[PDB]
From a paper:
The PΩ-Trp residue of both peptides occupy their respective F-pocket of [name]*58:01, which is typical of canonical peptide binding behavior. The side chain of P5-Glu forms hydrogen bonds with Tyr74 on the α1 helix and Arg97 on the β sheet tightly. P6-Phe forms a hydrogen bond with Asn77 on the α1 helix. Two different protein batches of [name]*58:01-peptide complex were tested, the data showed the average melting temperature (Tm) is 70 °C for [name]*58:01-[name] and 57 °C for both [name]*58:01-VSFIEFVI with allopurinol, or with oxypurinol.
Numbering used by the authors:
A (entry chain C): 1 to 9
B (entry chain A): 1 to 277
C (entry chain B): 1 to 99
Write the structure that this text describes.
Amino acid sequence: VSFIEFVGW
Amino acid sequence: GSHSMRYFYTAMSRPGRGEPRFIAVGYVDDTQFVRFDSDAASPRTEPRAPWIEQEGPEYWDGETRNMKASAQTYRENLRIALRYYNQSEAGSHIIQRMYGCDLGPDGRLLRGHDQSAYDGKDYIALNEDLSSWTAADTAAQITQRKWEAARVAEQLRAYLEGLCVEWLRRYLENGKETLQRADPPKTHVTHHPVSDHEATLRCWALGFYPAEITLTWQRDGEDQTQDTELVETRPAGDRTFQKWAAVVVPSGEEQRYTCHVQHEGLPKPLTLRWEPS
Amino acid sequence: IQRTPKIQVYSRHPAENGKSNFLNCYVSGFHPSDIEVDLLKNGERIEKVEHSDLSFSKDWSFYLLYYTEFTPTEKDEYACRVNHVTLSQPKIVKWDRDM
């Protein structure tokens, strides 16, 4: 199961 | 043996041809099990291995939603990268991401990974401590400062030590008949004259899984590393891999050469020679 | 900032004239990801060609497998034609049953 993004570059 | 799970993302901008394309693939060891492509007619996370098909609709709907969100994040990241490198909006650029977990033969977390690249060059990497970062340049240092302020490493650590390991173990159990089966190489040596006084000996390994393999030639028991042509391990299309190693040898000295094969599926390394018969 | 593709053209199983098989063209080591790959039979583009999903190696270079079902014969010539931004003209690699 994939990671949930929560921050950008 | 040891096992790993990895996700690979590629985000590719293309000014004048729509929003950046986002492609994600997931692997256990050398077996792909999911894909997502934002250019598909109906973008969805889709199965690519038989043992993942049993996951329920909640899995597929949730992974689709998550990959769509990740595509949006990486489109934003492409815009940010332009700012960080003083680049124009006219060029095409690529962000890549790889992350996941490695388990030892014991089954516990051996180590975690999370690395990103911009235009094919390292950008930022989570260190093995799962707590600090290595930035490749002064742009990535801006990202590093942002991620330190937001405590991003702590969330990655929680994912890599928790969900990543738990789901990898689930897949290894559900796919055990393939993921936990090593197929040894089928090996042989061919001989092809080059001239009246030289011939090529080619050592072949076919049909093996996983991809990791060592093929070496020795002359009089000494490795011939600098004189061996070694092709990249290549996929056969049936899950297995192929590789060969070749040396050019003086005619009449063929029996002084031995090929040595190491693979997880072999109880002991193989030694083979050219058999004129 | 760009890397040109390596190309291998080969069959899934050892070739035997008259026996169905798969022709593979494996392109790897390239960057950026846009690439055009055709499989050719006697110089003509084969229409039914599939490919793997885009992935990449630890050095960030991309790889793809293009493949099609085929039945080799003594006379038919097969090849892979690859175009990439790093190439000034398409590169054609012929299938050699011993490679």
